[PDB]
Amino acid sequence: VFRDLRHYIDTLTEKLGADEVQTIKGANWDLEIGCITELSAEKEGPALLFDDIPGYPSGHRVFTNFMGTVSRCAVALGLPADTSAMDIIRAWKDLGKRIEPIPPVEVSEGAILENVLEGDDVDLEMFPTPRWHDGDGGRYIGTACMVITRDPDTGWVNVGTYRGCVQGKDRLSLWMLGNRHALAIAKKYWDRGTACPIAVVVGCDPILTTAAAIAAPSGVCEYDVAGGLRGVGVEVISAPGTGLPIPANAEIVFEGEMPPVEEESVHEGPFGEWTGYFTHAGDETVVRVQRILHRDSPIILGAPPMIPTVPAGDQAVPLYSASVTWDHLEASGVQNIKGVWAYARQLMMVISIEQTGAGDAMHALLAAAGRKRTGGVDRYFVVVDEDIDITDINHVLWALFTRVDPAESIHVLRTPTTAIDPRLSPAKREAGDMSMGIVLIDACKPFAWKDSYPRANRFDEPYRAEIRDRWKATLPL
Amino acid sequence: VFRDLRHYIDTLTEKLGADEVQTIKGANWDLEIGCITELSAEKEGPALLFDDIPGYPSGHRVFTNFMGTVSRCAVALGLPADTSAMDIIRAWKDLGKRIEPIPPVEVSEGAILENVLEGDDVDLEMFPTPRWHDGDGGRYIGTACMVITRDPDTGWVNVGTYRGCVQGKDRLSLWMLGNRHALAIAKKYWDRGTACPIAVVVGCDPILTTAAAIAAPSGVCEYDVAGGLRGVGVEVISAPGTGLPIPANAEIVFEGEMPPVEEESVHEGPFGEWTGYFTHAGDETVVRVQRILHRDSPIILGAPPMIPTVPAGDQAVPLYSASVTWDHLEASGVQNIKGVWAYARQLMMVISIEQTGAGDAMHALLAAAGRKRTGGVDRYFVVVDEDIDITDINHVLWALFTRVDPAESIHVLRTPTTAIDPRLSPAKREAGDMSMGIVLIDACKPFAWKDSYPRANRFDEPYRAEIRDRWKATLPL
Amino acid sequence: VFRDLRHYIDTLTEKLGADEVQTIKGANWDLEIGCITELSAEKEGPALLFDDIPGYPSGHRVFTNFMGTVSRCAVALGLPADTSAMDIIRAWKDLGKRIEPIPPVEVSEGAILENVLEGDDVDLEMFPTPRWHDGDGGRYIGTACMVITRDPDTGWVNVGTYRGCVQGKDRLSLWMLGNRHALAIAKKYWDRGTACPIAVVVGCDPILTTAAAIAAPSGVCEYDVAGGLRGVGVEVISAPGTGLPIPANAEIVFEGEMPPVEEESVHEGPFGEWTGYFTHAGDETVVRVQRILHRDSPIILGAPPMIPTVPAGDQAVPLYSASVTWDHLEASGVQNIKGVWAYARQLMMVISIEQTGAGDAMHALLAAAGRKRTGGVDRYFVVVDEDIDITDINHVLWALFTRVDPAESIHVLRTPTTAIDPRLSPAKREAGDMSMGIVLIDACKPFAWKDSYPRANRFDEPYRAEIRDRWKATLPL
Ligand SMILES: Cc1cc2c3c(c1C)C(C)(C)CC=[N+]3c1c([nH]c(=O)[nH]c1=O)N2C[C@H](O)[C@H](O)[C@H](O)COP(=O)(O)O
Ligand SMILES: Cc1cc2c3c(c1C)C(C)(C)CC=[N+]3c1c([nH]c(=O)[nH]c1=O)N2C[C@H](O)[C@H](O)[C@H](O)COP(=O)(O)O
Ligand SMILES: Cc1cc2c3c(c1C)C(C)(C)CC=[N+]3c1c([nH]c(=O)[nH]c1=O)N2C[C@H](O)[C@H](O)[C@H](O)COP(=O)(O)O
Ligand SMILES: [Mn+2]
Ligand SMILES: [Mn+2]
Ligand SMILES: [Mn+2]
Ligand code: NA
Ligand code: NA
Ligand code: NA
């Protein structure tokens, strides 16, 4: 529950020390910002606040890696700064069950109205938008962002997150996969020979984009869902030109209309997919930007895609993957679950149970492998006992390294993949052949003889936590 | 919604002709009744009403195979006599979602009070109980039955179905698997050095035992659930001796108490498990029978176990298996489901989808294989396209025979089984080794080339149904 | 040993009651007859005798499903109406060994001469020929039929069964696979610039077509073989126009000549292959029909292809498949064979042995899998112990469901298939790639521990037969 981006940054330095966010002066938008973000992300550095970008006025800032740590996700979710990775999951999972839609609160004034820019004054190049990676088609101002549209017939307002590239001083490309709600709406104003009116937020309260990104059902306005996660409706404004609701204290908004493909498209160069590879460039859907709103010292909220095994700068904890699988395991009557986690979004799913029967391990693997398809590359599935910290790749590895008989525990299944999968050959795709496969890896102590298992040389968790909280100041631990 | 067994039999002959139930005179309780039931069941004969059993008074009857057909399950569920097998599933599945507990209705009079028998008059041998199979430990009067107990502290009343063998003129053995609600309750009166008071119904309205058998949650009195499936609470009576609620128009009730194992057990010979094999004999939990209630011409409702690939005389349609898997496939986001069915309870699960993507088939297989473990022998899983009648073993076979590449479509998975599995070796069990396996068989037309699939030489379903309903009288069809 | 079709129908109602054959009035040749045949066949109804077909004179009849039951095959083979399925096999197998060629008996008069039709009077459309399935290329009067030709040089007369479609009022298409004896002969009269003279029988004594269908060696006139199975030579007539021998009391004969492909072909639409799929339409070999002979109230003997897992209306017992495999198992020194059966012609072969050694089961599987290739789709092979009724799909299933360890007993072999196989992809065929595979499934009680196998809950066979023959009238059983 944040007022705006700045309340969030503050909150971070309140709960974590002034070191938790660090301001960087004189990095360049071209490659340099992105490359810093990527390395800092790998090293779980501070959240980065980029200032005095050469060619740009002071306070014209970029904020990256803003939720690229466990402890950060906890603050953002407003739990104790020191809440465990798996506790966050437990929390998220259970929030899921007790949240009702709380609508946005109208509100009359707000920081978004400090600088409004119309007709000629509309220059997208005014922002210090980075070119995040060599090979991007342009500069992607719209990453951790909101794309807002209103259904004209009902009045549902849908906020989702589509990549937005700067295509000129008044054009912003968006890429929406076929099935996107924004597009569903959009087509109402097309089959009526108007444009589809749209606003697009490119910096603001991260809880809001956390929500924009949530795969909310149709008809359901993800503004409400945000209200749900914070507990009070979000402070909002009729955008002047289009009427659409935008955040009162947002950082930067573009308003205006998006016509049909057949009338104006632009070339939307590649950008990185979630699997850590560049997707395809095409002629994409573009928006004519008619208004720019921005606060003084406007910050862009930047989440450029990284390879998925790097901490994800916009939520390092895999909230959705971990939690939704966990609900499926329960529904699938798997028992004594101690934890569910995902590395690289969903490419290794990990499950920690307490085995009470011979079939538990294989039952959890098949359960996890059969859950609701999402992003359509699946690969590894790993079950382990209740003494493995599955949020700690090292610990999971040691289990894969020391509790797996490869002749018995590795189950390679031959199954199809999806076009998105970087490992499908041109020859295969073209022939409609989607064969890939998955691995079910049973890394559990064998049940028949579990009590006879060699004992781990490692401190128990309680003690680990006694020493941690005792040697708090002194030493990272 | 039946008044009693006799309303049900009537209903059967009303909806199906007087041929649907047939009365059999002069078969013997020893083997002969059972053996007739088994063959008639295989041939989907009439529901059998056994009369003039030698050594027994007229009207002392046995009723078997009472729901051993699709069309019978439909009448019992009170849908059109001619409702399709899969329509029944669709119905059951959806009833599941709209039923609330409707409690039993007290009622003052009823047919159960025509003959009450106390102290010396209590002779279990009075009933023409069959010895259903050679190898049964005795005569099993308690098959399609209700075992009623009341929790003394709360007052929850639990009705479940445990095998009941006649162990003398006043003793009835029951076998309850460790985790049975009756036993949960029972242990309250043991840890208090009283017996556990119990009544046991051995003939009555089959909807009632349909419900007794439903794996209802703890705390939940499956009398209510019966109320749910019929739409009105069930007509019921405080049994005189124990207070427990029993059906007003029931056929035969035994009331009395069951002490702890350590005080009186009996040898409870084998009887057939659901997998079509004899389980183990042991010293079992026994009930001292103190009252016998029975109507004039009392009928025993008999469901002896058959091998599971025979039509199950007590519900030939696999209501629970088919429906609960279907809910899991939905939850697991499998789509365009046309049908789910099970042969031999759950040993082949079959799923009919309409493929819209390369991964559908394997996704449905894994989804089904990971669902909530129940009876703990799993074996085959089969997915097919939307033109297969999966309720017709012949049609499913032809798909397994003509749409499976064995080198690509048969996925043998190595997984553990449970002690109940007749194929686990003594050597394995003793060593705690439960290895068995399952098969995922993709019997779908290959998606990459589906439109090029050879065309089936078989009448479309609409036409099949035009000719069927047109040539109705004339010819079985 | 039947006089003609009518002696056969009679024989059926003599041995089985008047219910065994049922006369159907006012079904239409277009689809309706076929669709009734198919459903009645699935339900093992009566043999169907179709009368008063709209547009057609009375007694112009169609007879289907004429041998679509075990008990029917027994009557046809003239054994006790109640001979077991496997007894029929045992009988067939052993007949095979004691039959010598008994030639046809000349005879002077016969029912075939009641109506002869020449030049203009030749109208094939006169018969109430059904269009058996939607998708057939025309109406297939020639299904359960005889195609008779005489070798001009030697005088061998060959009768085989090729599909015959009505192609006009005086043209009948035949499709002969490359290697067919009729064609072998035919080519003698082509390489001599005459037509090949031919007669084609389309209703008659079913023993005769049983024989026409028998894959008799070259040089061997399958008229003789018929003599062998009945014990007396068959009553026969020089057809007037061509001289060829035809049955004295046949129902319907067409006589005339068939020229070479290059001189007159017709389009021979698809019809159903034995694997339950439509084959390819092509330009086919046609016969110019010059004579029509028919008895008063002439019946067409109709065996339309059904999917192979339906009871085959023309012999539900798989005489040839079951018996010839059985001889191979013997020759392959497999021992204590109790039974061999086939479902869907040959797509699951089943073998029942009495195991006396560790290697028996796998030895029977490989033996069966290596036998003489016939129709060129093979798929499943199943061995079981001597207590399985392998003629009862339910019983075989329960064995596959409860006696197979999938991790040990399922042997998938990678082997090529043939073009006929509906599951081979266009891409594969075109590349000359015939990979498919087969499964060897050992469903035997494991020998090492067989005596410890859980005991079947099912009535022994003797008793099953005591109750069956005791409760004969009373109840189907
Ligand atoms: C978090 C997030 C989600 C992206 C996304 C990105 C991020 C960071 C980017 C900016 C890094 C790369 C682009 N993204 C796209 C995307 N969906 C889409 O169709 N096109 C995209 O370009 N999504 C998915 C989208 O955010 C969620 O699936 C929404 O719930 C879908 O919105 P909707 O349900 O209202 O249609
Ligand atoms: C339909 C049915 C279910 C049997 C059953 C049978 C049938 C026909 C028989 C009579 C053929 C063989 C015996 N049965 C037993 C049984 N559960 C058990 O612990 N012991 C048994 O002997 N069950 C299971 C029981 O009916 C259901 O699982 C109940 O929902 C469990 O009751 P509860 O939930 O109240 O404890
Ligand atoms: C029983 C039977 C066998 C058919 C047959 C059918 C049936 C019902 C039909 C009518 C349903 C479909 C068509 N059939 C053809 C066929 N052989 C062939 O080359 N073309 C066919 O069209 N055969 C095979 C033929 O009957 C036997 O293989 C003969 O033994 C071969 O005759 P021959 O040995 O004298 O050449
Ligand atoms: Mn949405
Ligand atoms: Mn219960
Ligand atoms: Mn021949
Ligand atoms: Na969204
Ligand atoms: Na119950
Ligand atoms: Na032949």
mmCIF file of N, CA and C in Angstrom, chain A residues 90 326 329 333-340 351-364 383-388 390 403 444-447 450-451, chain B residues 373:
data_model
loop_
_atom_site.group_PDB
_atom_site.id
_atom_site.type_symbol
_atom_site.label_atom_id
_atom_site.label_comp_id
_atom_site.label_asym_id
_atom_site.label_seq_id
_atom_site.Cartn_x
_atom_site.Cartn_y
_atom_site.Cartn_z
ATOM 1 N N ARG A 90 3.618 -18.612 0.660
ATOM 2 C CA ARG A 90 2.517 -18.985 1.544
ATOM 3 C C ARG A 90 1.570 -17.796 1.658
ATOM 4 N N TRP A 326 1.173 -24.809 -6.329
ATOM 5 C CA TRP A 326 1.008 -25.306 -4.978
ATOM 6 C C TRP A 326 -0.463 -25.672 -4.759
ATOM 7 N N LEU A 329 -1.159 -28.934 -6.527
ATOM 8 C CA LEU A 329 -0.707 -30.120 -5.818
ATOM 9 C C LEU A 329 -1.718 -30.454 -4.723
ATOM 10 N N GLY A 333 -4.623 -33.873 -4.391
ATOM 11 C CA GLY A 333 -4.379 -34.546 -3.119
ATOM 12 C C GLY A 333 -2.924 -34.964 -2.867
ATOM 13 N N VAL A 334 -1.907 -34.158 -3.184
ATOM 14 C CA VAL A 334 -0.566 -34.398 -2.685
ATOM 15 C C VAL A 334 -0.570 -33.842 -1.281
ATOM 16 N N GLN A 335 0.211 -34.426 -0.355
ATOM 17 C CA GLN A 335 0.069 -34.068 1.057
ATOM 18 C C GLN A 335 1.392 -33.686 1.702
ATOM 19 N N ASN A 336 1.285 -33.137 2.919
ATOM 20 C CA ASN A 336 2.472 -32.688 3.608
ATOM 21 C C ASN A 336 3.348 -31.898 2.635
ATOM 22 N N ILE A 337 2.802 -30.940 1.862
ATOM 23 C CA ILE A 337 3.672 -30.096 1.046
ATOM 24 C C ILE A 337 4.440 -29.173 1.984
ATOM 25 N N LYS A 338 5.774 -29.148 1.913
ATOM 26 C CA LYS A 338 6.493 -28.099 2.623
ATOM 27 C C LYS A 338 6.814 -26.877 1.754
ATOM 28 N N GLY A 339 6.685 -26.948 0.428
ATOM 29 C CA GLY A 339 7.164 -25.853 -0.418
ATOM 30 C C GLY A 339 7.030 -26.111 -1.917
ATOM 31 N N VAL A 340 6.768 -25.056 -2.680
ATOM 32 C CA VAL A 340 6.866 -25.196 -4.117
ATOM 33 C C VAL A 340 7.632 -24.006 -4.643
ATOM 34 N N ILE A 351 9.370 -29.191 -5.741
ATOM 35 C CA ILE A 351 8.352 -29.496 -4.736
ATOM 36 C C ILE A 351 9.040 -30.156 -3.565
ATOM 37 N N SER A 352 8.747 -29.703 -2.347
ATOM 38 C CA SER A 352 9.261 -30.317 -1.132
ATOM 39 C C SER A 352 8.076 -30.922 -0.408
ATOM 40 N N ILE A 353 8.122 -32.233 -0.221
ATOM 41 C CA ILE A 353 7.123 -32.891 0.610
ATOM 42 C C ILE A 353 7.794 -33.582 1.786
ATOM 43 N N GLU A 354 6.944 -34.064 2.687
ATOM 44 C CA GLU A 354 7.316 -35.042 3.701
ATOM 45 C C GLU A 354 6.717 -36.386 3.280
ATOM 46 N N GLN A 355 7.562 -37.333 2.861
ATOM 47 C CA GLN A 355 7.047 -38.574 2.299
ATOM 48 C C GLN A 355 6.333 -39.382 3.386
ATOM 49 N N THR A 356 5.097 -39.797 3.148
ATOM 50 C CA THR A 356 4.549 -40.745 4.089
ATOM 51 C C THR A 356 4.197 -42.057 3.391
ATOM 52 N N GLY A 357 4.492 -42.195 2.083
ATOM 53 C CA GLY A 357 4.137 -43.417 1.378
ATOM 54 C C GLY A 357 4.900 -43.530 0.071
ATOM 55 N N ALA A 358 4.997 -44.767 -0.450
ATOM 56 C CA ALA A 358 5.965 -45.120 -1.467
ATOM 57 C C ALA A 358 5.732 -44.301 -2.727
ATOM 58 N N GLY A 359 4.464 -43.916 -2.936
ATOM 59 C CA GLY A 359 4.012 -43.310 -4.160
ATOM 60 C C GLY A 359 4.014 -41.780 -4.128
ATOM 61 N N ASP A 360 4.410 -41.181 -3.004
ATOM 62 C CA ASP A 360 4.245 -39.749 -2.849
ATOM 63 C C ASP A 360 4.990 -38.962 -3.931
ATOM 64 N N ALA A 361 6.256 -39.353 -4.157
ATOM 65 C CA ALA A 361 7.257 -38.628 -4.921
ATOM 66 C C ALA A 361 6.791 -38.621 -6.363
ATOM 67 N N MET A 362 6.512 -39.794 -6.907
ATOM 68 C CA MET A 362 6.113 -39.842 -8.295
ATOM 69 C C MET A 362 4.743 -39.168 -8.488
ATOM 70 N N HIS A 363 3.873 -39.285 -7.469
ATOM 71 C CA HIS A 363 2.579 -38.622 -7.520
ATOM 72 C C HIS A 363 2.691 -37.090 -7.550
ATOM 73 N N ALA A 364 3.725 -36.535 -6.913
ATOM 74 C CA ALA A 364 3.861 -35.094 -6.884
ATOM 75 C C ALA A 364 4.408 -34.596 -8.247
ATOM 76 N N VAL A 383 11.174 -33.451 -7.234
ATOM 77 C CA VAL A 383 10.674 -33.534 -5.866
ATOM 78 C C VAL A 383 11.790 -33.902 -4.892
ATOM 79 N N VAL A 384 11.738 -33.280 -3.709
ATOM 80 C CA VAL A 384 12.682 -33.586 -2.655
ATOM 81 C C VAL A 384 11.977 -33.644 -1.292
ATOM 82 N N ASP A 385 12.752 -34.063 -0.257
ATOM 83 C CA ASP A 385 12.219 -34.278 1.073
ATOM 84 C C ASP A 385 12.073 -32.912 1.757
ATOM 85 N N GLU A 386 11.660 -32.938 3.034
ATOM 86 C CA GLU A 386 11.330 -31.707 3.726
ATOM 87 C C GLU A 386 12.570 -31.010 4.286
ATOM 88 N N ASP A 387 13.745 -31.630 4.277
ATOM 89 C CA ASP A 387 14.929 -30.909 4.739
ATOM 90 C C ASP A 387 15.641 -30.087 3.627
ATOM 91 N N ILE A 388 15.164 -30.060 2.379
ATOM 92 C CA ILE A 388 15.805 -29.236 1.344
ATOM 93 C C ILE A 388 15.210 -27.829 1.287
ATOM 94 N N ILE A 390 14.251 -25.478 -0.984
ATOM 95 C CA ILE A 390 14.059 -25.480 -2.421
ATOM 96 C C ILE A 390 14.172 -24.052 -2.999
ATOM 97 N N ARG A 403 20.939 -37.390 -4.201
ATOM 98 C CA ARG A 403 19.793 -38.207 -3.828
ATOM 99 C C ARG A 403 19.079 -38.832 -5.034
ATOM 100 N N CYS A 444 13.996 -37.646 -3.950
ATOM 101 C CA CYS A 444 13.636 -37.945 -2.570
ATOM 102 C C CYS A 444 14.534 -39.072 -2.020
ATOM 103 N N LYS A 445 14.865 -39.013 -0.704
ATOM 104 C CA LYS A 445 15.460 -40.161 -0.012
ATOM 105 C C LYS A 445 14.512 -41.352 -0.311
ATOM 106 N N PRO A 446 14.955 -42.481 -0.916
ATOM 107 C CA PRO A 446 14.061 -43.684 -1.048
ATOM 108 C C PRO A 446 13.332 -44.127 0.223
ATOM 109 N N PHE A 447 12.009 -44.237 0.088
ATOM 110 C CA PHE A 447 11.129 -44.420 1.226
ATOM 111 C C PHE A 447 11.382 -45.771 1.918
ATOM 112 N N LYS A 450 14.580 -44.935 4.025
ATOM 113 C CA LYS A 450 14.802 -43.522 4.285
ATOM 114 C C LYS A 450 15.501 -43.236 5.610
ATOM 115 N N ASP A 451 15.046 -43.854 6.703
ATOM 116 C CA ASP A 451 15.641 -43.765 8.019
ATOM 117 C C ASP A 451 17.103 -44.223 8.049
ATOM 118 N N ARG B 373 -5.276 -39.627 -5.804
ATOM 119 C CA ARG B 373 -5.164 -41.059 -5.581
ATOM 120 C C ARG B 373 -6.414 -41.533 -4.829
#
